[PDB]
């Protein structure tokens, strides 16, 4: 059983996903990838991290397999800072691809208060995707005492 | 003028540094590399010269050997954060030159390897930044 579920929508850059696998193993998250991926799921990682990663043809297929978890989408076009939420066990965190970000139809399927953004300084480049996932997951984990369950 | 100072001790992998540059620019951090490398951003020959050039700020080091969880510190504007390399980690004599209550660890599941270097920096800086209300100053 996993504290949180990380969902990467059409990830493109192999080392980002590799770093995210390591993050999820450390924090106790499950990892789900929505096809098509920009790379083949073949770098430093073990078996008990790499073998639990799941792929799905469509985002809805993933959400159905997860039992329709509480879902947050992390997007610069987000109405609300990510740290304002009170996260809880079983929450799912949805991130867009490195070069495109989430489709409009995916983002708008969520309530306005569940489209979240990290604090960005105006004029700056985007954060690297795996850094964004790590900061999000550790904020949610911090709110739960860093419990290992 | 920079809220925090990120100090990388002998960083090895370039992509981590590209990620960390972007993280620091967003959080308002300066970036400092202690030479030698393997590939608001400056380089230094040894650690004390960076600390001096920075005005000797409060210094925390982030390590698995850490005596204290990173989220238990109350961070302040001007704090400096020291991270060891990807391949072998902070030298023993560098880490032991910090007070015990300033050698911090990120929460680790048993039997897990450390986070990527740039992910460790990202989580550390954003927790400090969160404590300061994510002020852009």
Numbering used by the authors:
A (entry chain A): 4 to 45, 52 to 158
B (entry chain B): 4 to 42, 61 to 158
Authors' own words:
YibK contains a trefoil knotted backbone topology.
We first determined the crystal structure of the wild-type PaYibK in its linear form (PaYibK) to confirm the same trefoil knot structure and the dimeric assembly as found in HiYibK. The N- and C-termini of PaYibK are separated by ca. 8 Å in the crystal structure, which is sufficiently close for the head-to-tail backbone cyclization without disturbing the backbone knot structure. The root mean square deviation (RMSD) between the backbone Cα atoms of the crystal structures of PaYibK and cYibK was <0.2 Å, confirming that the backbone cyclization did not perturb the 3D structure of PaYibK in the folded state.
